[PDB]
Design a protein around this ligand. Structure first.
Ligand SMILES: N[C@@H](CCC(=O)N[C@@H](CSCc1ccc([N+](=O)[O-])cc1)C(=O)NCC(=O)O)C(=O)O
Ligand SMILES: N[C@@H](CCC(=O)N[C@@H](CSCc1ccc([N+](=O)[O-])cc1)C(=O)NCC(=O)O)C(=O)O
Ligand SMILES: O=[N+](O)c1ccc(CS)cc1
Ligand SMILES: O=[N+](O)c1ccc(CS)cc1
Lengths: 219, 219
């Protein structure tokens, strides 16, 4: 079939959700394959020998690893459909900067909130809230980080919203009171079909996180 | 140009070296401005308020932060001069993957060689050599990672060669004997004027590293 797209993923992975969103936004037919990360398939190990991680996008038999790299590949190949990145080089560089920011910070800071204790824990909490505020900043009055439509930064960032109940609980943090504009933005994203069908609810992820506390290192 | 191009950098920085090579490869005249990372300038804090890191490319007064993002911006803007990335989306995705790989581990694996001790040091060293081997294998038969011309992966990676005397010494490993294909590749790169003009000698970097032993956590 005259285009084959397969996604190796694991449902609560925020990195995998980015690729699910980009696929749905582009209206791309694909096959979703769930991995058990305790028992990774020989397919996964062949397709991502370097990192042995999901997500892996497999397009006509060829793998693209690293979620943001896969989203950019999607943008460049499915170029006759909803653009996810700006065409102006400087604007594209800023878009990349903020996706990178999320990609370097939010996952790792979130995990730190619950692997640390005492004053180090409070340091990480402070930094996480500061990160949300900087992003709220960058968003301003816009409907989405992409403007009037979902863009690369929305795709990079909105999956992390699904981990918020876990961050709030295990990291002892009132995100909603501190950052109502961030929350409002994420709920706007959830009004898009491409996002709504790609993301699990906060409650399901929260339960899964407790089920994986040892591997996650809580606390 | 006519175009104002300024690079805020620190001479032994491998990240800064990436941008230096890309500018030189495109034949772009630039002003180089050295930063003291112990006393970051108001200019630096203004241009990179988020990360407060070098390099920062300033093009006509506008900053582009993150070395790989700046290299891509240079490729996209100076698009009528020596291409640094492939035109094919899949090949571009692979170059991004391998640049990301370098950009992940090589700096951090290298440093871990000398921040750790005993049996954990031996692990870091093992993983580091393993990384170089994966890169030698990705290089395969080609003159450069970019083929017959320097490409994005060469730009991303070759700066780390300048830290090799430090890795070898402070990390107690014989890279030249274990990874001779890698070393042969780095020396080919150093024959290119754009690279030679941009990189300090291993000897100068080695001395600097000892001068910054406290800040770098050697060990
Ligand atoms: N940089 C990559 C990051 C992808 C990633 O972290 N993938 C994780 C799953 S989601 C993040 C995650 C990691 C670990 C747990 N856990 O329960 O331990 C849960 C979620 C993975 O495949 N890990 C393989 C492994 O851990 O061996 C990208 O952007 O694609
Ligand atoms: N992700 C960035 C990484 C850039 C980066 O790490 N820059 C370092 C300088 S080179 C890497 C480096 C880091 C630290 C030392 N040292 O001596 O301690 C030397 C070199 C920096 O500005 N650090 C700010 C700081 O240290 O406050 C990129 O790709 O541009
Ligand atoms: O919410 N989810 O975790 C989830 C959503 C959509 C798919 C594609 S079948 C897979 C998982
Ligand atoms: O080798 N170097 O460290 C180095 C080379 C070129 C410049 C631009 S003036 C600055 C530093």
């Amino acid at each position: 079939m005259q285009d084959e797209v397969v996604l190796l993923d694991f449902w609560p992975s925020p990195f995998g959700m980015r690729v699910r969103i980009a696929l749905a936004e582009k209206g791309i037919k694909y096959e979703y394959k769930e991995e058990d990360l305790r028992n990774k398939s020989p397919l996964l190990l062949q397709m991502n020998p370097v990192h042995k991680k999901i997500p892996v996008l497999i397009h006509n038999g060829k793998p693209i690893c690293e979620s943001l790299i896969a989203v950019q590949y999607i943008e460049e190949v499915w170029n006759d459909r909803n653009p996810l990145l700006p065409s102006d080089p400087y604007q594209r560089a800023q878009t990349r900067f903020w996706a990178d920011y999320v990609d370097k910070k939010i996952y790792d800071l979130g995990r730190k909130i619950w692997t640390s204790k005492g004053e180090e824990k409070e340091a990480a909490k402070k930094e996480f809230i500061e990160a949300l505020k900087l992003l709220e900043e960058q968003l301003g009055d816009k409907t989405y980080f992409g403007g009037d439509n979902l863009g690369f930064v929305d795709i990079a960032l909105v999956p992390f919203y699904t981990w918020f109940k876990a961050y709030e609980t295990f990291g002892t943090l009132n995100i909603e009171s501190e950052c109502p504009k961030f929350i409002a933005w994420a709920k706007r994203c959830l009004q898009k079909e491409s996002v709504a069908k790609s993301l699990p609810d906060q409650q399901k992820v929260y339960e899964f996180i407790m089920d994986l506390r040892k591997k996650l290192g809580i606390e």
